[PDB]
Amino acid sequence: HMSVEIDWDNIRGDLSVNQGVKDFLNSRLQEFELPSYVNNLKVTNFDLGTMPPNVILKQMDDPLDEFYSDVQLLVELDYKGDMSIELSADLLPVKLRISDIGMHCLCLLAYLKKQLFISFLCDVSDPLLENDKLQVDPSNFMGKRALERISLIRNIKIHTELLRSVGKLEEFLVDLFRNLIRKEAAWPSWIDLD
C-alpha cells in the first residue's frame, strides 16, 4: 500500500472539528435518562490525541443515499491513542476525564456540501464478519444482523475529582459513552460535522 502522510497537529488543532464533537456529544448526551443523583452533565472539552491513528483506505464511493436531506471513504480505522474527553456534573460538583479510548474498526467517512459524516460500521474483529454476515461493502449492506454487533470502543479509562462509590458512577459513565456512540455515531447513525 502507498501511504500518504498528513499533519496530525493541524487536524488535532482544528477549531471546526473540536467544537463539533463537543456539540455532538452534548447534543446527544442530553437525550438520556440519567439517575436521580446526577445533574448538569456537560462536555467541557474534547481533545483528539497527540497520537495519530493509522488509517487504511478500503474504498472510495459516492456518499450513500441515506444522507438524504462529493466523496465517501470506507476506511479501516485503528485508534490506539490518547484521545481525551473532559466533563462536569453536579450531585457536589465534579470533573471527569475519559481517556485511553481504544478503537479498531471499519468506518464510513462521507464528505459532502461541506459536511462530514462519520459512521462507525463495526469492529474489525467482529465475528459477524466471519462469513459476510454483515455486508459492510456499501456496494445487502449492513442488515438487521447489525444488531448483534460487538462494541466499537475497545479501551476506555476514567478519573474523577471534586467509601469509593465513585466506582458505581465511573461504571455508569463508561456504560453511557459506550451506549451513546453505539446509539448515535455508529451506523445507521453518525457524527455530523462542517
Swiss-Prot record:
Could you tell me one molecular function GO term of this UniProt entry? lipid binding
Record has Transport as a keyword:
yes
Sorted alphabetically, the Gene Ontology cellular component annotations on this record are: endoplasmic reticulum membrane; ERMES complex
Q: How does it sit in the membrane?
A: Peripheral membrane protein
Q: Name one GO biological process term.
A: mitochondrion-endoplasmic reticulum membrane tethering
- Per the record, the domain of life is Eukaryota
Keywords tagged on the record: Endoplasmic reticulum, Lipid transport, Lipid-binding, Membrane, Mitochondrion, Mitochondrion outer membrane, Transport
Subcellular location(s): the record lists: Mitochondrion outer membrane; Endoplasmic reticulum membrane
Residues in SMP-LTD domain copies: 2-194
Where is it predominantly found?
mitochondrion
**Do the record's keywords include Acetylation?**
no
Similarity-based family: Belongs to the MDM12 family.
Instruction: Please give the record's comment on domains.
Output: The SMP-LTD domain is a barrel-like domain that can bind various types of glycerophospholipids in its interior and mediate their transfer between two adjacent bilayers.
User: Assembly state and interactors?
Assistant: Component of the ER-mitochondria encounter structure (ERMES) or MDM complex, composed of MMM1, MDM10, MDM12 and MDM34. A MMM1 homodimer associates with one molecule of MDM12 on each side in a pairwise head-to-tail manner, and the SMP-LTD domains of MMM1 and MDM12 generate a continuous hydrophobic tunnel for phospholipid trafficking.
Q: What does this protein do?
A: Component of the ERMES/MDM complex, which serves as a molecular tether to connect the endoplasmic reticulum (ER) and mitochondria. Components of this complex are involved in the control of mitochondrial shape and protein biogenesis, and function in nonvesicular lipid trafficking between the ER and mitochondria. MDM12 is required for the interaction of the ER-resident membrane protein MMM1 and the outer mitochondrial membrane-resident beta-barrel protein MDM10.
Protein name as it appears in the record: Mitochondrial distribution and morphology protein 12
Organism, by scientific name, is: Kluyveromyces lactis (strain ATCC 8585 / CBS 2359 / DSM 70799 / NBRC 1267 / NRRL Y-1140 / WM37) (Yeast)
Q: Please give the range of the full-length protein represented by this chain.
A: 1 to 234 of 305
